[PDB]
Swiss-Prot record, chain A:
UniProt-reported outcome of changing residue 251 to T: In HHF6; diminished sensitivity to GTP
Modified positions (Phosphotyrosine) in chain numbering: 68, 445
UniProt effect for mutating residue 255 to C: In HHF6; diminished sensitivity to GTP
Taxonomic lineage from the root: Eukaryota, Metazoa, Chordata, Craniata, Vertebrata
Residues the record lists as Phosphothreonine modifications: 343
GO terms of molecular function: ADP binding; ATP binding; glutamate dehydrogenase (NAD+) activity; glutamate dehydrogenase (NADP+) activity; glutamate dehydrogenase [NAD(P)+] activity; GTP binding; L-leucine binding; NAD+ binding
Originating organism: Homo sapiens
Source taxon at top rank: Eukaryota
Residues that, per the record, bind ADP: 383, 449
InterPro entries, A to Z: Aminoacid_DH-like_N_sf, Glu/Leu/Phe/Val/Trp_DH, Glu/Leu/Phe/Val/Trp_DH_C, Glu/Leu/Phe/Val/Trp_DH_dimer, Glu/Leu/Phe/Val_DH_AS, NAD(P)-bd_dom_sf, NAD_bind_Glu_DH
Binding positions for substrate per the UniProt entry: 80, 104, 371
Protein name in the entry: Glutamate dehydrogenase 1, mitochondrial
Reported modifications of this chain: ADP-ribosylated by SIRT4, leading to inactivate glutamate dehydrogenase activity. Stoichiometry shows that ADP-ribosylation occurs in one subunit per catalytically active homohexamer.
Length: 487, 487, 486, 485
């Protein structure tokens, strides 16, 4: 199950790093293996809180609702985590997810801890008024015990909670408890743009997974082992599951020349070797129901996991790949777009077959990065780039004028050259400048710089295509370094 | 079974009894009050439960992780009260059960407190004093940062596994780090030693409470006529089933007012003497060496003292000491439940059938919490009780007694009558005035006022000798009144 | 012989006397108890001291920089008591010594306070009344931001060179600038006028304190038998040196209970009359014009009054009065140290040589500290003392007297009313006020502290050296506070 | 000692500036001269505090430690200072150093006050487990009386302390008092890179010294007045002392075209007319002991202070220059590296024969500028340039593409102006926060040097730059009091 796999991953990663850590990372009496209790400190969750609060139903009825919150690590003061509305949430689930969140944050180098929430409520049972009342009471109860403050803990949306729920979170801390706090509105991430949101929030995960895939494809050394090399172009990719992540990943990946051979979903699959236009399929999906039946698309009989392709993106529920299904696959690269779609056993088969598996701890951190950017914007009290767009535009025009004049007063006998016309792509960028470009640039830079680090760690620790342990080792090293010089 | 089921059953029975009379002529509409009474399902569960895991460094420089819990049941009255236990078998269920019990226990004696309990999975007789101090320090800091220790939020108290030494540390920790700017920083914990801000007479609190609780029912003519024995303490026999703090301190006070002890038990063989056992000589012998084994002037008693002939048997050793097997052989008349629930629920039925009253454990041992409340008040006052009134009262008494002889001499005229001399008891009271007198008087008044309320509640609902379900009904009604009139 | 050296020597002697038996008599391992006596090392030095330099604008528009100091000594009890002096003689070491003395003075009386003292290097005679207000307000401003004025942190008090005006000017400034949201902002200081939240009986507190201190030791049969007089007031003459607030308010209460005053000293010639001197007439004469020089009821006694034949001496004028030179020429068998350190340590050896009792200054003049504590408590309680109980007590007393009357009438059957109270009781009932309560509290506190001091002298086989007994008492109490602290 | 001279500097500056400030700085009844009480307000230190806190040693014996801290000026809320761990600290020393810190911060337009602290203890005879206890207790005691706050006072490490202590202070403050403050970790500067530090902090002071020397060298008028040609390549320099500042200054000076004639330290001096490679010298020094016995260089005998160099950097202990050796020096420019390496008496001799001396007040501000940048980062909760590097890269590539397209349109060819130079490619590939920090430091030093040069001519001052800098700082701090009430 999912609760034990994270602990197993941590245990596997904590034994590989200890030998190198004890020797060349301390400055006595060989009593440093006893200092490896720092790993034991990191391993368990710090705080867990259980709640039971009453609400008033529409028909004059009283009910009790129970919720949970867990904070794993507090080496970084702002804890980060999501809120889940479901009727099957448990303490162990939030424990495991909070434990995963701190490593996820540490991988992409954001200064956040780890958290997770959960309310034993079925969303499709209550009126919007009742949901709002539940949200308000939960916010108040969490804030009274020190679990909501902008400098303490910051909730984030999930699959079962939209931005509407977290619009209510903001104007309950800022109206009751954080009235005197100047940064009261910064205690939540994922709020709408009108309330202090960030542009480009929706397409964060798709751009993140696209950049993560792109970074590894353009690596000659790694691609040489798989025997495909070049880069993009003529590559064939298939996606299973057509959520937000899958849709945006397919769009951004097809924009750069990749061909989408097939698309999977809960209903019947879609198969077309000629390629599928993401825009047309998205329009069909939004028009009516699912993609069951699509023009210029022959339905695929049988599972698409074994279909012939180059990149496979399993952006769906967990445990999509098992030991039995492992030998039958044919894709040379698996890009884990969801939370743990591969069983630990199947990793052994993939390693034995010389198949690269991009870890899920790395690929889908674009949402966390954009949430961090939103938190920074809320702290700054100003949208990004508002005070610099015109300045850069004027500087670029001046530089072009200088180049044109320098060229003119060199051949100034016959010629009216005008090297001051920006290209159409540059003109469109200049005219359409906004904070969305800044957010996307920051995301791309972050996910390139954090890919270089994981590649270096994998090379250093003398391990092959097993990138998951490399990511876990990198995160554990960072956390141990944080604890080491703190006392 | 476990105490959780027992307290749940007690609450359910009390709520079922009180619901019928809580709506008729108690609330001011289409019989919708049967839905407004859903407050009873809000009081039942615990509001907050917190789980900890914090590191310490041992004496040999080795790190380890210690986990603890803290649960708060009700918050209708802000300052919560509870104890802290240092044991290796503490669990989340037990701490919630004790927290739930504490609210009703406080409500019975009209102290304005909530309910809470704490536990640390630790063995106290396994560590040096330095690391015990470190554990307490870190536990207090972690519990304070989440809002669980504040003087106006939550106040702890010593349990059987902790002492005043372990809470002088708590008071110092809170007053030094977090509550530095709070004028009532030292009021964040009770049970402190007298030098740090304690209250006199704390050790003899529970025994005085047990004595006053017994004496309240002893002088009740109706109950004595019902169960057939003379009122007062003229010729009465009590057998103590334990020589701990509560038993030792309560057993002296009974003898001070004409009661005779015939048998005393312990974890070893009991000592029996029909002529009587001297209180003062017994504890000197116990302190001289080991336990009461081999005590002179007392032939050993073969068998179980529970079935021994007595009238005021006090089961103050442990829990679950009266099952359905030994119940039929009990030849007592009044059972003083000094311990924390030593009678099984099934034994209550046979005791009622035999027409033998049992003083509830929810009422008999509230002297400790009452004295803790007085200590909290004293720390909020920044002055000892009676400091500014002893000399004034003495002068007033002397003047008032002087006036009488002046008036008599004015009337009768010439001899020198001298009614201005007080008795030996009054002289000792005047010269020996201190805070413990005020504390004892307050405790006696509190239990005297609670006893009559229990009488009235038992008479209201046509209950006989079932005082436990009457005390529970009192607590439920009193805690419901606060909720109903607030919204 | 600066006060710092004397207080350091007193503390050292007390620590040396107490430690040898404190090693094992009261503790609980393996004889590290002697090595855990760094607590006495922590006791001696002052924890904090702060120096200031703040500007003011004079009435003529000129600017000036003013210096000030404040020191905190123990902080074993969170609030700290202290005074403020406006004189061009204050230094850091004097402030530290006074704070150290105040810590033990509070400890010996069982009042939960620390030790503090402040000073400003100005001469009040060279400043306009308007300039003093702004100087004081700026001093409070600078002192508040560093955590030295808070009601739960540090609470000052007036002194010889300051009055109620400064206390008002600091209370309102703190309540209006920093402690705006505090509910006990007005409790940050003591000595305020009654209108601003003061307490009754503040002015006559020290006189009652010294009177009760003398009265407690006069009735001690054991000391009186070995000293050589008859216990109890009566046929006992006393003299007072220096005639200020303390001297006047002590002489009044001493004469009220039957003590004849025969000589009064001051900065000028003394006045002597074997018959006695009426305090009221002397006070009226002093208030009428100038000093008490030329009193038309006695003779201008020549020579130092310290050698005058009497039983009780009150050196309440200034310090370093009784030295070794005039030590053997005195005749009084009891000396009451009204002021702060009127006897040099060298002179005390002579008094101990010929069994002359000396009441320590540490314990005698604590009435001001006690009444300041009571005023602080009243400000905390937000209500004057005895507001909810005077009529209740009156009704209870009347009911008790009526019950006695009716019960007596049952036994014998005409009117025999035991209902009329005595004149002293009827007057007390009518004129009830919180002044009675505070005086009663002062009397009880002094009575309870005197016996506690008496115990330690028998405990350590000390003779008539009560000063070291009081110092040992304070040291033991503070050491206990640290010991059970952790 | 080192307090009378710093008081005299302020006295001279105030006497110089008072007349102009009362005459030409306003547009009433000649009572403005009575307003010069502001100058006498500035001089004395505002607050000083002494401490006595107990600790228990490893063997279990209790000890008492004394500590000091002084805050000079409160005209700007956050005060910047330092912590000294030595058994030679006194109230006079910390007061004088805080007073100097005030003007040092004021010169380079850094919005901080003046502060300084010291603990009277010897770190040599204490274990690592005891130093942490001392630091934590000192931090707690200093915090409870309002001396540590992020908006109150920000301590910094000194020569006797390291970055290990700063981490302890930050951890202690953020766990007890600053728990409720979002800016808890901004209370201390100098923390390790993993706790909130900034890259390039280690090489701050040397780079600042190099920038100051470079800025004064390029000033044509000053070189003409001194009497030698401008430019930098032909010059030669000699250092004294091989600490951090000397090492980094020598490295940068050689990297920008200078020859190191000699190097001096506590041991014997090392001399080579052909120059010394800083990398080889640093490797030799780090290999074993001092720089004694360095090959490829002659063992100079005597004092290097009289060497026939061009510019001299006395980065060593105080009072290294006095009247005795004043006339025997031949350096045209003296660049003070440490705090006050020359006596005020020698300044007259140096001015007598037009020898320019660069004040230690201005040349030593790199470490405080970088500290200000670190404080700003800790407030911003994000690294510098994280959200702008890749945007700037795309903007830079688009300009080159536009130029390429326009040139191809005009001539047509296959012109390729898209490729950047070999240095710009390395710059864009290796962009990081150190570049931003260095650029900010260089800008600050250039602006400060221009300001003091401008103020030198306004008051008709000669080659005396020390008094010019002091006058500039006094004038800068006067306005804050003047336009406030």
């Amino acid at each position: 199950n999912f609760f034990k796999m994270v602990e197993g991953f941590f245990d596997r990663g904590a034994s590989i790093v200890e030998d190198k850590l004890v020797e060349d990372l301390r400055t006595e009496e060989q009593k440093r293996n006893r200092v490896r209790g720092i790993l034991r400190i990191i391993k368990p969750c710090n705080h867990v809180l259980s709640l039971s609060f009453p609400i008033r139903r529409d028909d004059g009825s009283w009910e009790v609702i129970e919720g949970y919150r867990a904070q794993h690590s507090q080496h970084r003061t702002p804890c980060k985590g999501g809120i889940r509305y479901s009727t099957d949430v448990s303490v162990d689930e939030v424990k495991a997810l909070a434990s995963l969140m701190t490593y996820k944050c540490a991988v992409v180098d954001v200064p956040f801890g780890g958290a997770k929430a959960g309310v034993k409520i079925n969303p499709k049972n209550y009126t919007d008024n009742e949901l709002e009342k539940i949200t308000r009471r939960f916010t108040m109860e969490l804030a009274k015990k020190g679990f909501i403050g902008p400098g303490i803990d910051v909730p984030a949306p999930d699959m079962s909670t939209g931005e509407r729920e977290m619009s209510w979170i903001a104007d309950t801390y800022a109206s009751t408890i954080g009235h005197y706090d100047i940064n009261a509105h910064a205690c939540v991430t994922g709020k709408p743009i009108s309330q202090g949101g960030i542009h480009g929030r929706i397409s964060a995960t798709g751009r993140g997974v696209f950049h993560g895939i792109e970074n590894f494809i353009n690596e000659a050394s790694y691609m040489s082992i798989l025997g495909m090399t070049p880069g993009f172009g003529d590559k064939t990719f298939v996606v299973q599951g057509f959520g937000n992540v899958g849709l945006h990943s397919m769009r951004y990946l097809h924009r750069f020349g990749a061909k989408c051979i097939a698309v999977g979903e809960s209903d019947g699959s879609i198969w077309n070797p000629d390629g599928i236009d993401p825009k047309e399929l998205e329009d069909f999906k939004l028009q009516h129901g699912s993609i069951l039946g699509f023009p210029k698309a022959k339905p695929y009989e049988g599972s698409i996991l074994e279909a012939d392709c180059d990149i496979l993106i399993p952006a769906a529920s967990e445990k999509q790949l098992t030991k039995s299904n492992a030998p039958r696959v044919k894709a040379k690269i698996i890009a884990e777009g969801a939370n743990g779609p591969t069983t630990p056993e199947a990793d052994k088969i993939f390693l034995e077959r010389n198949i690269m598996v991009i870890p899920d701890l790395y690929l889908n951190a674009g949402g966390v990065t954009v949430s961090y950017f939103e938190w920074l914007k809320n702290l700054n009290h100003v949208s990004y780039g508002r005070l610099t767009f015109k300045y850069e535009r004027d500087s670029n025009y001046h530089l072009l004028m200088s180049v044109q004049e320098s060229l003119e007063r060199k051949f100034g006998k016959h010629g009216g050259t005008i090297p001051i016309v920006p290209t159409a792509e540059f003109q469109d960028r200049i005219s359409g400048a906004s904070e969305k470009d800044i957010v996307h640039s920051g995301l791309a830079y972050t996910m390139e710089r954090s890919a270089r680090q994981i590649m270096r760690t994998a090379m250093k620790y003398n391990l092959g295509l097993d990138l998951r342990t490399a990511a876990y080792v990198n995160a554990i090293e960072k956390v141990f370094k944080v604890y080491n010089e703190a006392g």
